[PDB]
Amino acid sequence: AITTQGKRIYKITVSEAGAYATNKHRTGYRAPIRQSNYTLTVPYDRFLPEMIRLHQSGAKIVNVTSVIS
Amino acid sequence: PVAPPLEFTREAERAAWLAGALTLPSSLGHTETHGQERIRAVGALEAAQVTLRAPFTEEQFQGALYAIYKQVFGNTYVMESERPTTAESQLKDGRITVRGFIRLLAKTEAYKSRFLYTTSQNRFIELNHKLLLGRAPYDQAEIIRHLDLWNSQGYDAEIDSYIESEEYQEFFGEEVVPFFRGFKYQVGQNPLGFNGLVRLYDGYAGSDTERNQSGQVARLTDRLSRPVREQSSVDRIERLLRSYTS
Amino acid sequence: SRTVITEVIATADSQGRFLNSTELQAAFGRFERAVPAIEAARALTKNQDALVKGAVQAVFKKFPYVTQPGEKGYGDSNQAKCARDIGYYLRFITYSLVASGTGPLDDYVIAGLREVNRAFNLNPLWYIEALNYIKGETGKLLSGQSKTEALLYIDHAINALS
Amino acid sequence: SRTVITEVIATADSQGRFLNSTELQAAFGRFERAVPAIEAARALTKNQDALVKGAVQAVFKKFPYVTQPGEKGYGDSNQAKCARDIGYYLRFITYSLVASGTGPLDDYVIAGLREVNRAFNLNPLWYIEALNYIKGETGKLLSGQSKTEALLYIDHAINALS
Amino acid sequence: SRTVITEVIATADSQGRFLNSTELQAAFGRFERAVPAIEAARALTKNQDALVKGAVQAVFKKFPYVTQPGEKGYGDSNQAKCARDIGYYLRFITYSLVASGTGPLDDYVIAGLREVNRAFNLNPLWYIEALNYIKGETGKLLSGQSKTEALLYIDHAINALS
Amino acid sequence: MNDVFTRAIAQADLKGSFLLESDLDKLASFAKEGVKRLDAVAALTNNAPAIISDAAHKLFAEQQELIQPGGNAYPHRRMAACLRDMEIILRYVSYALLAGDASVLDDRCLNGLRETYNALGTPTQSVARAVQLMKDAAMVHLKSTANVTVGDCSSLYSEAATYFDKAAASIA
Amino acid sequence: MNDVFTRAIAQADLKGSFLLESDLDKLASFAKEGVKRLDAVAALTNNAPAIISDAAHKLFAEQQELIQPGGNAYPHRRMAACLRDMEIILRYVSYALLAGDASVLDDRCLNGLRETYNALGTPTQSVARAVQLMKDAAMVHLKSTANVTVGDCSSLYSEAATYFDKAAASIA
Amino acid sequence: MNDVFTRAIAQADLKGSFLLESDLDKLASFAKEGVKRLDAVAALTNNAPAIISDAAHKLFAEQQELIQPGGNAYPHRRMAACLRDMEIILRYVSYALLAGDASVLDDRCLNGLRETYNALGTPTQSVARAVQLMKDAAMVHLKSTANVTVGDCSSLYSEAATYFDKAAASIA
Amino acid sequence: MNDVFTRAIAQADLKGSFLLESDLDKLASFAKEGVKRLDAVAALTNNAPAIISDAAHKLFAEQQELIQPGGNAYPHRRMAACLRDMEIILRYVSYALLAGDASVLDDRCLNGLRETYNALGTPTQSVARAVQLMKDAAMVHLKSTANVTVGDCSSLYSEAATYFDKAAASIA
Ligand SMILES: CCC1=C(C)/C(=C/C2=NC(=C\c3[nH]c(/C=C4\NC(=O)[C@H](C)[C@H]4CC)c(C)c3CCC(=O)O)/C(CCC(=O)O)=C2C)NC1=O
Ligand SMILES: CCC1=C(C)/C(=C/C2=NC(=C\c3[nH]c(/C=C4\NC(=O)[C@H](C)[C@H]4CC)c(C)c3CCC(=O)O)/C(CCC(=O)O)=C2C)NC1=O
Ligand SMILES: CCC1=C(C)/C(=C/C2=NC(=C\c3[nH]c(/C=C4\NC(=O)[C@H](C)[C@H]4CC)c(C)c3CCC(=O)O)/C(CCC(=O)O)=C2C)NC1=O
Ligand SMILES: CCC1=C(C)/C(=C/C2=NC(=C\c3[nH]c(/C=C4\NC(=O)[C@H](C)[C@H]4CC)c(C)c3CCC(=O)O)/C(CCC(=O)O)=C2C)NC1=O
Ligand SMILES: CCC1=C(C)/C(=C/C2=NC(=C\c3[nH]c(/C=C4\NC(=O)[C@H](C)[C@H]4CC)c(C)c3CCC(=O)O)/C(CCC(=O)O)=C2C)NC1=O
Ligand SMILES: CCC1=C(C)/C(=C/C2=NC(=C\c3[nH]c(/C=C4\NC(=O)[C@H](C)[C@H]4CC)c(C)c3CCC(=O)O)/C(CCC(=O)O)=C2C)NC1=O
Ligand SMILES: CCC1=C(C)/C(=C/C2=NC(=C\c3[nH]c(/C=C4\NC(=O)[C@H](C)[C@H]4CC)c(C)c3CCC(=O)O)/C(CCC(=O)O)=C2C)NC1=O
Ligand SMILES: CCC1=C(C)/C(=C/C2=NC(=C\c3[nH]c(/C=C4\NC(=O)[C@H](C)[C@H]4CC)c(C)c3CCC(=O)O)/C(CCC(=O)O)=C2C)NC1=O
Numbered sequence A: 001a002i003t004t005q006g007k008r009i010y011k012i013t014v015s016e017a018g019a020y021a022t023n024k025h026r027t028g029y030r031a032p033i034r035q036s037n038y039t040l041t042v043p044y045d046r047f048l049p050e051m052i053r054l055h056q057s058g059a060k061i062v063n064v065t066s067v068i069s
Numbered sequence B: 001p002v003a004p005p006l007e008f009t010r011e012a013e014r015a016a017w018l019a020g021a022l023t024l025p026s027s028l029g030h031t032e033t034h035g036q037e038r039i040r041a042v043g044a045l046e047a048a049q050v051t052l053r054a055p056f057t058e059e060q061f062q063g064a065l066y067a068i069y070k071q072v073f074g075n076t077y078v079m080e081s082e083r084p085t086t087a088e089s090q091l092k093d094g095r096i097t098v099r100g101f102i103r104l105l106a107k108t109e110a111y112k113s114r115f116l117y118t119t120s121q122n123r124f125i126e127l128n129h130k131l132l133l134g135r136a137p138y139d140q141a142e143i144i145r146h147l148d149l150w151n152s153q154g155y156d157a158e159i160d161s162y163i164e165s166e167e168y169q170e171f172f173g174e175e176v177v178p179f180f181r182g183f184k185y186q187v188g189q190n191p192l193g194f195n196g197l198v199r200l201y202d203g204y205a206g207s208d209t210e211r212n213q214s215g216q217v218a219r220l221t222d223r224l225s226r227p228v229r230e231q232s233s234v235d236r237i238e239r240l241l242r243s244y245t246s
Numbered sequence C, D, E: 001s002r003t004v005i006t007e008v009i010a011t012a013d014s015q016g017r018f019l020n021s022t023e024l025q026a027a028f029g030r031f032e033r034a035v036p037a038i039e040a041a042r043a044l045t046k047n048q049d050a051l052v053k054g055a056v057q058a059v060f061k062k063f064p065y066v067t068q069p070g071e072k073g074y075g076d077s078n079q080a081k082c083a084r085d086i087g088y089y090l091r092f093i094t095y096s097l098v099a100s101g102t103g104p105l106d107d108y109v110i111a112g113l114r115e116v117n118r119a120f121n122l123n124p125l126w127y128i129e130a131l132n133y134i135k136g137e138t139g140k141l142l143s144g145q146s147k148t149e150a151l152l153y154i155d156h157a158i159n160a161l162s
Numbered sequence F, G, H, I: 001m002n003d004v005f006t007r008a009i010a011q012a013d014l015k016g017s018f019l020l021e022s023d024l025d026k027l028a029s030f031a032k033e034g035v036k037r038l039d040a041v042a043a044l045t046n047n048a049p050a051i052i053s054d055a056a057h058k059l060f061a062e063q064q065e066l067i068q069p070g071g072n073a074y075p076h077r078r079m080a081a082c083l084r085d086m087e088i089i090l091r092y093v094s095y096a097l098l099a100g101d102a103s104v105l106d107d108r109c110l111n112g113l114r115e116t117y118n119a120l121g122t123p124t125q126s127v128a129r130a131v132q133l134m135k136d137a138a139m140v141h142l143k144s145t146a147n148v149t150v151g152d153c154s155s156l157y158s159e160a161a162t163y164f165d166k167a168a169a170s171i172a
């Protein structure tokens, strides 16, 4: 994170529409429920792992913004 | 004609009579109505979840902070000369979740000072599990994976392996403060997970303190080590015998 | 077990702090309502036999087909277990009257309720009917405040089953 | 700024559950205390100005060096700010009395209080002595439940100050 | 089974009367005599397999011909089931210790012993001296009060075999 | 006939194993606290006329239609048989209390009593009521603190109540 | 997350003065009727699952296109979630009734439910109809004069009706 | 974990050898009776609630002591624990059945269980008897001849009995 | 973690019984004396900083060796730890005073305390001495007749003293 690639974090809005709702129904509701639509901040280094994680869960993104540059 | 009509007064009467010997006091259960007292985890289990709904107000933000600094660091004291105030401010408006805040506290120099520098890597892996997850490690595969991951990619990636794991997503998620959960049967564990969380958690008053004459030695790597890697003992025996008798 | 006192202490220690004014407000409210609640527990304790018998009768009357052979409620043993379960439920209602909280209920009966009633094939509706009878008799047995709080614990148990 | 009622709502919604007998009982006690609390708050609102002046004179007679130049107190605007701050504290104490909870007081003063005192070099003992003066004088203005609850709130404010 | 308690009850029963002083006298003697007997049973049970192995090898050492081919002790089944028989005798001696009476011995072993020994040609002497070995081994296995009880029951078994 | 020790022994033998440590603990506790049991059995034995008389008084003061002509306790022979049955049931309850096991009761008093009372026309409901009245009169006597050292015997009260309830539920 | 008292204190701070006399009088009047409010809250919390079941039965009755294949609540899980929202919104209405301020419902969920339901494809006018069904059933249960001291509670009736109506209008 | 194929590979490698032709013979055998093994595992999977409930009924038949007040399985929160322990041990027995070795059973289930139960105060003899009762109630569902081809499978019943015995001996 | 009510409930459920009317009377008397109990808890809570500072001053006067080099309480970190420990102990004694039972102490306060001190090398006799000083300082504040009505609370003073003795005995 110290180098240049470390900075330029990104802001991502996340929607948990029925595609993830069905998966959460089947797997169960074990954490408190939350509204489907929300926004999340992510650094450049962690971008790929968290994005793989969120799509693998089933939620779908609307758009992604670049915080720096 | 035992009871032709819809009334059952004889059947209810005889049921209530025979139920007297079905509810007799047993042999003894005084030390048994609470087996958690033997596990010494009564306080840990009776500690409820500490969530932070984003529109939360000023009060219980300090409550969530107390829970976090009690969990992540253990019961070790953390002087507010050490509280990252910028991280708490960022968490206040939700610029970061409780998961991101716990990521930061894991990556502060106080957490490292208490857990990394004074201990071997084994104790560090056990403590990461017990604090950022709530459970003892189940098998040597976890220890090997985390040790090699740290060695190859840094403390940063080693911690990110905990914080953004799917176990953290499922059990706690973005906005629930971690808690000790190995005392209950968590799906897909060994019986060594519960034993390990009992071994690491010696008391509610106690803590995992660096400033100790033990040197904060590893409580569990001996416990965790044998089961996976002693099935080959039966042959290493006679190999050692031929080495000795030579 | 949770009570007013224990919930107060738990919230206070979850913030490492002392008992503030609100904690003492709640605690004294409990100490003030612990007179009617102990009255209700005394009444429901004088009358364990009447309530257990009546509840077993009401269960059988609303569920006659279990008494017949080839199913669950046949035998001296299984009806004795019926009366014993109703004694358990009434006993824990009296406990939760004394402890002025749903601690004993949620700890003993309501925890692990669906799983045990599922693996032994017992039915929620039997106990719901027994508890509706106990609620009825409590209405005629307790008057005023004690009646109200006893009904809060009884219908807490009912909603736990339902 | 949550009283007993709103903290009940928050803790009940925390578990995703309705409100059972314990927290309804606590809210009942709080409602019944809303009468002496309102009376005590009315009594203090009757006596706001005399208390602001008595507090500034008390803190000055206890702290003489503050009057002398070279210290914070010297300057007409400075004692004006003193009186304004004591008015703030009294207003928040009356607010907490009305709300029957430390919500208003805690969030409106105690939140980030120590940092304010350090960054503006205000010694807390000034406000502590003012609040002890208010305690002593309310010892006679109020009686019974109103007196003890108002004194408890003042003690909470002092403890948060020291 | 014939014990002290049961014999008391049967004697006071056949006569159609309540339990008078002598009967409770004997019952009390049994109740306080229990503890040495219970300890003897715990010791014999803990040291069960060693005692059985010792008694088996004592049978073979004293009766050397029995293991020679062509007769009773020859072959693995007969040794394993010698061990079984000695285990039975030991188990019933401990049963009789716990019950503090010769009920279990006189029921499960002594009643019908001569007929089944005759019909299988089992020499009683094998069992008599295996019980003699156990009788000796309790001397260094038990000591004090319970030794008399254990010796007494080993002794009754030996007398019944002879 | 049985008691607690022989019951545990029979279970262990039918299973084929020595008595386990826990069962030995249970029997040791039973024998240790059996002195209170002797006091209870003595309380039943020594006051038995009082129990029988109070139970008879109450039964015949609440159920008049027994002592009426044509009632099934009318002449002295039937009243004497009533009192004799009451005494016998109390006797077997005291027996089973001393033994700690209700097998003697279920084998000598209760294995053919409902059938006998039906074949004689005696209302088994009234017999069970008589048994419960005897239970009440006896509990007034087992809780007596005179002439005995103070202590707790809630276990023995529960046990005796269950024996009386066994008699009642196996006659009714 | 604020009640009537906290709102009054909020306006007191915005004007900066102490709490006046009329404000304190309304607050005292509200505190006088506290037990009335508690009784309505207890009714709601006790009869909650009954109210949910009745509302679900009715709504699935008059309108059936949900239950057909391709309908919104067709699959077994989706209508399970419908009952989950049933209970959630009814619970939050009980909360707003206890507090006295609907804003704890409003800011928490009413803003976001519009967008989340438009995303899911759930038709929200049906949600409003459901809320009206719930208000009908809850008003029926609150009408119950049984088992409680009697008094004039029309203010509570109107206020709960307002809670449900505004929640429906917000979701619709 | 080690099924029989990886087990044989292990003993082949630790002695620095390839797999001898005889080893391949046994393991190809295992492969061909694999379908019978699949049938047995499916029998254990599908009849799991029946086996567990039958073992529970029997176990609390002999030892009513557990379900009395003060007994381990009493408080109705420990009954669910008992049933879940039964489910876990049955699940691990079926796992060891499909695999072919007790490696799964002895690694993920058994190494730290007797001392876990000692820590909780749970009696281990009762858990052992529960597993034995489960073995009984599971052979009969395992021997069921309905809706499946007929053949000799005494090897699989012997093996499943060994696994149940090993679990019981571990916990006991 | 059990108050007095839940303690009576638990030892009732061990007997598998309803709470006796004697226990009901005891817990009713406790609930009646709860006003005294609350005033004592409040007196401890308000004067927590005064009590902790006073006990610290007396402890460091009678015992100096802690604060010179090599002593237990030397750096600012260890002085902060000492004050934090004493504050926690006073907090838990206030908790126990409200609960009426020492369950909270053994559950949370003293659960692993003595082991912690013997690990870190803290002189446990010094911690007991600090607890004794808090006892002495706290009885003074509890006996403060000012601002409360007059009544005999000697039972509460003895109870708080016993709580402090229990903490001291456990630590030492
Ligand atoms: C970060 C500080 C730290 C280190 C590096 C450390 C070493 C270490 N070596 C280990 C295993 C091992 N260690 C070795 C190396 C030895 N074995 C052979 O005899 C070699 C000749 C000899 C090397 C000189 C081997 C081969 C293993 C693997 C054993 C196994 O997987 O079962 C393990 C347990 C699991 C693993 O990491 O594989 C640790 C923790 N301990 C620490 O606290
Ligand atoms: C801590 C509180 C507690 C509760 C609530 C409880 C419920 C309960 N009742 C049981 C027995 C039973 N309960 C019933 C059903 C009853 N009998 C019939 O007469 C009626 C129709 C019906 C009552 C209305 C039956 C048939 C059994 C024994 C057989 C079985 O269902 O497995 C059992 C199983 C115990 C056993 O196997 O013997 C439980 C767990 N147990 C507890 O320890
Ligand atoms: C209730 C308790 C009980 C006892 C005591 C008992 C004794 C007993 N031993 C038997 C057989 C036997 N028992 C022995 C004992 C011999 N074995 C060695 O050689 C020794 C020399 C010696 C033992 C000290 C032998 C050899 C047999 C087989 C003889 C035959 O099959 O005819 C048999 C015939 C049934 C059978 O085992 O097949 C009985 C009934 N059985 C019982 O149920
Ligand atoms: C000859 C026949 C015979 C009798 C009559 C007899 C009575 C008897 N009762 C005793 C104590 C006792 N007796 C009782 C029973 C009483 N306390 C309870 O509160 C009730 C009021 C009542 C019973 C329901 C108790 C509780 C003890 C003390 C328990 C113990 O010994 O450990 C003792 C031992 C002395 C002692 O430890 O104090 C004897 C010998 N023993 C006999 O061998
Ligand atoms: C603040 C508390 C909260 C609320 C109130 C809330 C509403 C809500 N209900 C949902 C599911 C649902 N909700 C419904 C309800 C519809 N079915 C029909 O009966 C009606 C038209 C209507 C209800 C009256 C259905 C069918 C689903 C399933 C949609 C899907 O999984 O695709 C979802 C999708 C994700 C999830 O369930 O977590 C949300 C966000 N979510 C929350 O976290
Ligand atoms: C823990 C929960 C709780 C309950 C259950 C409770 C019942 C309760 N209702 C009361 C009076 C009352 N309760 C009610 C409410 C009822 N009357 C009618 O209007 C409606 C059918 C219904 C409300 C919609 C009323 C109107 C009063 C009379 C008090 C007044 O005049 O304001 C009182 C005061 C003492 C008494 O009159 O006995 C209590 C304690 N209090 C509580 O704190
Ligand atoms: C993956 C392998 C694995 C197993 C098998 C396992 C067993 C296990 N059973 C437990 C509890 C329990 N288990 C039982 C069951 C016993 N009580 C009766 O005697 C029955 C006869 C008997 C059941 C066969 C009971 C009653 C408890 C509750 C103990 C308590 O809460 O005090 C616990 C403590 C956690 C909890 O409270 O749920 C464990 C760890 N854990 C594991 O990780
Ligand atoms: C999806 C999982 C799956 C299953 C369950 C399965 C069952 C299965 N069992 C088969 C034969 C068989 N099935 C059995 C099993 C039964 N016979 C014994 O008597 C017992 C009652 C019982 C075993 C304990 C046996 C013995 C055979 C004969 C296989 C052979 O000749 O070696 C066959 C081959 C011919 C056929 O019936 O279609 C299949 C496919 N196949 C699968 O892919």
Ligand SMILES: CCC1=C(C)/C(=C/C2=NC(=C\c3[nH]c(/C=C4\NC(=O)[C@H](C)[C@H]4CC)c(C)c3CCC(=O)O)/C(CCC(=O)O)=C2C)NC1=O
Pocket: I057, I060, I067, I073, I074, I075, I076, I079
């Ligand atoms: C890292 C080493 C270390 C430090 C720095 C430290 C600070 C310290 N100073 C103290 C006493 C004190 N120090 C002072 C200093 C004041 N006296 C006059 O007023 C001056 C204006 C001013 C001096 C510049 C005073 C008044 C006390 C007494 C506090 C009391 O007893 O209430 C005390 C309490 C008793 C003691 O330890 O002696 C501590 C803990 N403690 C340590 O272990």
Ligand SMILES: CCC1=C(C)/C(=C/C2=NC(=C\c3[nH]c(/C=C4\NC(=O)[C@H](C)[C@H]4CC)c(C)c3CCC(=O)O)/C(CCC(=O)O)=C2C)NC1=O
Pocket: B075, B076, B077, B204, B205, B206, B207, B209, B210, B211, B212, I066, I072, I073, I078, I079, I081, I082, I083, I085, I086, I088, I089, I108, I109, I110, I113, I116, I120, I122, I123, I126, I127, I130
């Ligand atoms: C359940 C609530 C709870 C308790 C009870 C508790 C006691 C406690 N005190 C500690 C440190 C300490 N505590 C003290 C207190 C001593 N100093 C003087 O000797 C005094 C006589 C005495 C105070 C009465 C000191 C000096 C330390 C630091 C010792 C060291 O780290 O070497 C620690 C180690 C944590 C750390 O690393 O800082 C614990 C766990 N902690 C808790 O979370």
Ligand SMILES: CCC1=C(C)/C(=C/C2=NC(=C\c3[nH]c(/C=C4\NC(=O)[C@H](C)[C@H]4CC)c(C)c3CCC(=O)O)/C(CCC(=O)O)=C2C)NC1=O
Pocket: C021, C024, C025, C028, D144, D145, D148, D149, D152, I032, I035, I036, I038, I039, I040, I042, I142, I143, I144, I145, I146, I148, I149, I150, I151, I152, I153, I156
């Ligand atoms: C803000 C929360 C709150 C609390 C905690 C509270 C306590 C409280 N103290 C009271 C008076 C009292 N206070 C005390 C206690 C005192 N007696 C003296 O000896 C001691 C110095 C001291 C206790 C150690 C006593 C004895 C009473 C009289 C009430 C009675 O006797 O029942 C009363 C009843 C009013 C009266 O009878 O005058 C309450 C409710 N009230 C509240 O509104």
